[PDB]
Amino acid sequence: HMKNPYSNQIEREELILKYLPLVKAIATNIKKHLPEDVDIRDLISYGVIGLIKAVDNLSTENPKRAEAYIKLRIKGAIYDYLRSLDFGSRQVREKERRIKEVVEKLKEKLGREPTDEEVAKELGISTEELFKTLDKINFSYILSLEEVFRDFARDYSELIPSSTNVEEEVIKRELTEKVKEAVSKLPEREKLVIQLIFYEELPAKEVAKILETSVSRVSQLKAKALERLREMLSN
């Protein structure tokens, strides 16, 4: 049954409007892993562009499926923008090396784990500068891991629309089991940090308080865990 132009226009706007809270939720969740300096309005901005494009290229009539697709495009547009930034730059990777060295040097020299104030001191920077750097470093590993997950999504987002619910469940199970295999090969300490960060949805700063350690420590554990997962899932 044909549809009038005013109707198409309105259905579209209502659909966009309907999912704006979703863009907020996604931007906020991603913000927990980004340096404080990244403006959530930028994330939301790109996230809305992603939302509008998803709505236009929509034809699936299984609401839950439309939503899962919308969610996927929003995350995609936000990571598309974040990846165009300097996260994977050489300067960031260099700072990561310098920091690991400094941390290890202080560990032996003190017999214990250094504090963030002590790490920033041996580096000659403020703790705010350090927290930013650790966030950029950690986000680089998030980006790299996202590339892997996107490879999977790029494939299954082409099948699910013409697949049955039972088949979708199978495709989804193959993904969960593939991730479960990699997760099982993480050290207890790393796995615990990953759970508190992603399953409990807690920023590194909060995880530091729970584990009674420094932010620098929680960060190396997160980066190591994220690095492992990428290699594991890539092979």
């Binding site: 409007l17 907020k24 939301i44 809305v48 207890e188 399953y199 807690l202 308080k209 729970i210």
Partner: protein, 77 residues
């Protein structure tokens, strides 16, 4: 505003002349400002931390591969 304004802002966006990229950057920013106007993010953050830490010290916190999987998948997909 938290409905009437959004609908109006979306209207400006979907109407693009007026020089797109430039105008849209502002419109998009305004849409973002409306969505995060009444932001007081931390609801039970402080309590969740305490409850979690107290449970980890009490040896009452389960770390499973299922939860970590649910975490990563929900975050990335």
């Amino acid at each position: 505003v938290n409905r009437i304004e959004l609908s109006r802002l979306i209207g400006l966006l979907l109407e693009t002349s007026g020089t797109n990229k430039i105008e849209d950057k502002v419109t998009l920013s305004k849409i973002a400002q409306e969505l995060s106007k009444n932001d007081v993010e931390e609801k039970d953050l402080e309590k969740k931390v305490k409850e979690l830490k107290e449970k980890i010290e009490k040896g009452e916190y389960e770390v499973s591969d299922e939860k970590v999987v649910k975490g990563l998948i929900e975050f990335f997909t």
